Structures are given as structure tokens and as C-alpha cells.
Amino acid sequence: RMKQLEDKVEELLSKNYHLENEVARLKKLVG
Amino acid sequence: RMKQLEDKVEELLSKNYHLENEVARLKKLVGER
């Protein structure tokens, strides 16, 4: 269980970084 | 140590959901998906 939680943290972090890059992209297209 | 990791998952999931909602909104604005 400890490793699966450690893996899920790292996974969500990378998803969050992606969604932040999308916002910045879509914010550029509004300009 | 488990409680700490479970708390981190819950925190990052919530952040995810908020970014997702914002991306959905901006895509309608620009005329994307």
C-alpha cells in the first residue's frame, strides 16, 4: 500500500502540471 | 506515513478537478473543444 500511494502522488502531480500548461496555452489563444 | 500520502493524493486530486474545470471554460471561449 505505501508504494501505491507514493506512485499515485507522483501521477497526480504530473497531470496537474499538464493542466497548468493547457490553461497557459488556452490563455495565449484568447490574446 | 500512510495518512500523509493519502492526504497528498486527496490534495492533488482536488487541484486536478479545478484545473479541469478552468480548461473546459477556456476551450469554450476560444472555440475549441
Summarize the model shown:
Chain A has 31 residues and is mostly helical.
What is the overall number of helices of chain A? 1
Gyration radius of chain A, in Å: 14 Å
Helix content of chain A: over 70%
Q: What letter string, H or E per element, gives the SSE order of chain A?
A: H
Number-wise, the strands of chain A total 0
**Beta-strand percent range of chain A:** under 5%
State the assembly state of the protein chains: homodimer
Category by helix and strand content of chain A: mainly alpha
Structural domain tally of chain A: 1
Largest protein-protein interface: A-B, 18 and 19 residues
For the largest beta-sheet of chain A, the strand count, sense and barrel status come to: none
Overall 3D geometry of chain A? rod-shaped
- How far apart the termini of chain A lie comes to 46 Å
PDB class: protein binding
Keywords: protein binding
Assembly: dimeric
Entry title: GCN4 leucine zipper domain in a dimeric oligomerization state
Written description of the protein model:
The structure is a homodimer. Chain A is mostly helical. Chain A has one domain (1-31). Helix content of chain A is 94%, strand content 0%. Chain A has one helix at 2-30. The first copy, chain A, is rod-shaped and about 45 Å long. The first copy, chain A, starts with a helix and ends with a helix. The interface between A and B is medium-sized, with 18 and 19 residues.
